[PDB]
Design an enzyme around this catalytic site. Structure first.
Site, PDB file in Angstrom:
ATOM      1  CG  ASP A   1      -1.946   1.154   1.022  1.00  0.00           C
ATOM      2  OD1 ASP A   1      -1.623   2.321   1.529  1.00  0.00           O
ATOM      3  OD2 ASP A   1      -3.047   0.729   1.004  1.00  0.00           O
TER       4      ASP A   1
ATOM      5  CG  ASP B   1      -3.569   4.042  -2.114  1.00  0.00           C
ATOM      6  OD1 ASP B   1      -2.833   3.083  -1.824  1.00  0.00           O
ATOM      7  OD2 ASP B   1      -4.623   4.300  -1.493  1.00  0.00           O
TER       8      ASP B   1
HETATM    9  N1  LIG Z   1      -7.719   6.848   3.580  1.00  0.00           N
HETATM   10  C1  LIG Z   1      -7.309   6.832   2.734  1.00  0.00           C
HETATM   11  C2  LIG Z   1      -6.520   6.534   1.346  1.00  0.00           C
HETATM   12  O1  LIG Z   1      -5.721   5.238   1.254  1.00  0.00           O
HETATM   13  C3  LIG Z   1      -4.994   4.869   2.295  1.00  0.00           C
HETATM   14  O2  LIG Z   1      -5.256   5.355   3.529  1.00  0.00           O
HETATM   15  C4  LIG Z   1      -4.565   3.324   2.070  1.00  0.00           C
HETATM   16  C5  LIG Z   1      -5.542   2.480   3.135  1.00  0.00           C
HETATM   17  C6  LIG Z   1      -6.480   1.971   2.255  1.00  0.00           C
HETATM   18  C7  LIG Z   1      -6.113   2.095   0.856  1.00  0.00           C
HETATM   19  N2  LIG Z   1      -4.787   2.882   0.874  1.00  0.00           N
HETATM   20  C8  LIG Z   1      -7.992   2.585   2.646  1.00  0.00           C
HETATM   21  O3  LIG Z   1      -8.114   3.763   2.565  1.00  0.00           O
HETATM   22  N3  LIG Z   1      -8.755   1.811   3.262  1.00  0.00           N
HETATM   23  C9  LIG Z   1      -8.245   0.401   3.121  1.00  0.00           C
HETATM   24  C10 LIG Z   1      -8.852  -0.764   3.415  1.00  0.00           C
HETATM   25  C11 LIG Z   1      -8.163  -1.822   3.390  1.00  0.00           C
HETATM   26  C12 LIG Z   1      -6.759  -1.851   2.776  1.00  0.00           C
HETATM   27  C13 LIG Z   1      -6.225  -0.635   2.370  1.00  0.00           C
HETATM   28  C14 LIG Z   1      -6.936   0.402   2.658  1.00  0.00           C
HETATM   29  C15 LIG Z   1      -7.134   6.681   0.037  1.00  0.00           C
HETATM   30  C16 LIG Z   1      -7.992   7.997   0.081  1.00  0.00           C
HETATM   31  C17 LIG Z   1      -7.012   8.972   0.039  1.00  0.00           C
HETATM   32  C18 LIG Z   1      -6.066   8.935   0.940  1.00  0.00           C
HETATM   33  C19 LIG Z   1      -5.161   7.694   1.442  1.00  0.00           C
END
Ligand SMILES: N#CC1(OC(=O)[C@H]2C[C@]3(CN2)C(=O)Nc2ccccc23)CCCCC1
Ligand SMILES: [Zn+2]
Length: 394
Positions: A34, A224
């Site tokens: 990630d 991402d």
């Molecule tokens: N919030 C956020 C963002 O992505 C993250 O923090 C990581 C963790 C992630 C996917 N990438 C997520 O969000 N839910 C999740 C659930 C399971 C696995 C990975 C993830 C996406 C929006 C912009 C800011 C960054």
């Protein structure tokens, strides 16, 4: 870097993961790669979606940091206990690092049924680590403790009772020339927190969306790997969908399709790829007033799902969706490209991937340069909260 090729696996739409070991003796776990976060965190207590989890107490080299951690995403969240242990990537560099590890004790809408991963490897910068930027991310520890160069690269390769298996490569410490063709083009990292970039223009089949370029980066644009879709800010999503609908208008799909919530199907082998347009995102170049474009096909943004019922058909999900937290260049985008995270030079490279899915008329492309004169600023400045402002940074 041959031993790191094909070191990622997963199920289509459910994340790419790398095998890692934590502890002495080594506990093996599958860890989501990630680039949208900065914590190393592993399931550490039973959960309905985990086959297995990290047992701190069985490791002779675990050290408890006696501090909790809470991590909420826009979707999904978890908490745990911080510590350090010994960590290795078997199909990775030949090294072992002592790294921070968050042992996840509770979670909600985080683990994915059937995904086959049990933790997350956050490869972005300290500035967004939790609970704060003093918790050294994994990659920083790897670079500090070993000789590994401060760069990694990702090749994510796209695809009846199970979702399709997918493969990819995470090259730790360099660039493997077998994984791309043609030119590698770099875009500056705007700030080291996320892997934040700047989009300066968007076209749908050669047609400019003609939005103020700040709309493209409102409130940020980030790369991402752990986000599955291409996610676009509301205004951009709506313009983009209007154009894609227009191009494809011989086919009238249900609203659910365009909301990413419903499959659409054609007879095996008969998908009319040519009615869907290519999407080009122009990214800021290393040189002022230059940009280059990355061009993705419907084969990237239409995700294949074999329908248990109508398994005779090729069916697809629309894998572009609306964002309220900026543009997210997720696995959809990355499946076109070999993506080089050149932390040493504060830039991200894109080249045409040697595994991208395409057809006989069109290809995913990386092309430049393109030149503006007096290229205006397309970046957004996020409103600074008192909470954020009050933090000290010693
Ligand atoms: N919030 C956020 C963002 O992505 C993250 O923090 C990581 C963790 C992630 C996917 N990438 C997520 O969000 N839910 C999740 C659930 C399971 C696995 C990975 C993830 C996406 C929006 C912009 C800011 C960054
Ligand atoms: Zn202070």
């Amino acid at each position: 870097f041959v031993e790191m090729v094909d070191n990622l696996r997963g199920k289509s739409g459910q994340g790419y993961y790398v095998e890692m070991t934590v502890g002495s003796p080594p506990q093996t776990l599958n860890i989501l790669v990630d680039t949208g976060s900065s914590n190393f965190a592993v399931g550490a207590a039973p959960h309905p979606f985990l086959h297995r989890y990290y047992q701190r107490q069985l490791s002779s080299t675990y050290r408890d940091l006696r501090k909790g951690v809470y991590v909420p995403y826009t979707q999904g969240k978890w908490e745990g206990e911080l510590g350090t242990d010994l960590v290795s990537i078997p199909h990775g560099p030949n090294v072992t690092v002592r790294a921070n590890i968050a042992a996840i004790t509770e979670s909600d809408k985080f683990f994915i049924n059937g995904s086959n991963w049990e933790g997350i490897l956050g490869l972005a910068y300290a500035e967004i680590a939790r609970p704060d930027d003093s918790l050294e991310p994994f990659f920083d520890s790897l670079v500090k403790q070993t000789h590994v160069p401060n760069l990694f690269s990702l090749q994510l390769c796209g695809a009846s009772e199970v979702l399709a298996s997918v493969g990819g490569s995470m090259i730790i410490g360099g660039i493997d020339h077998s994984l791309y063709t043609g030119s590698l083009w770099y875009t500056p990292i705007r700030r080291e927190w996320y892997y934040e970039v700047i989009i300066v223009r968007v076209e749908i089949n050669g047609q400019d969306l003609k939005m103020d370029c700040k709309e493209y980066n409102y409130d940020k644009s980030i790369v991402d790997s752990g986000t599955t879709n291409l996610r676009l800010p509301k205004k951009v999503f709506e313009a983009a969908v209007k154009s894609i609908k227009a191009a494809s208008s011989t086919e009238k799909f249900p609203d659910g399709f365009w909301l990413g919530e419903q499959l659409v199907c054609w007879q095996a082998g008969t998908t009319p790829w040519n009615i869907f347009p290519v999407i080009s995102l122009y990214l800021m170049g290393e040189v002022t007033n230059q940009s280059f474009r990355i061009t993705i096909l419907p084969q990237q943004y239409l995700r294949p799902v074999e329908d248990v019922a109508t398994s005779q058909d090729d069916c697809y999900k629309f894998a572009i969706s609306q964002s309220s937290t900026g543009t997210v260049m997720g696995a959809v985008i990355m499946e076109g490209f070999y993506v080089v995270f050149d932390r040493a030079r504060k830039r991200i490279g894109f080249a045409v991937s040697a595994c991208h899915v395409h057809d006989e008329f069109r290809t995913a492309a990386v092309e430049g340069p393109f030149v503006t004169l007096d290229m205006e600023d397309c970046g957004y400045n996020i409103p600074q909260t008192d909470e954020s402002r009050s933090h000290h940074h010693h």
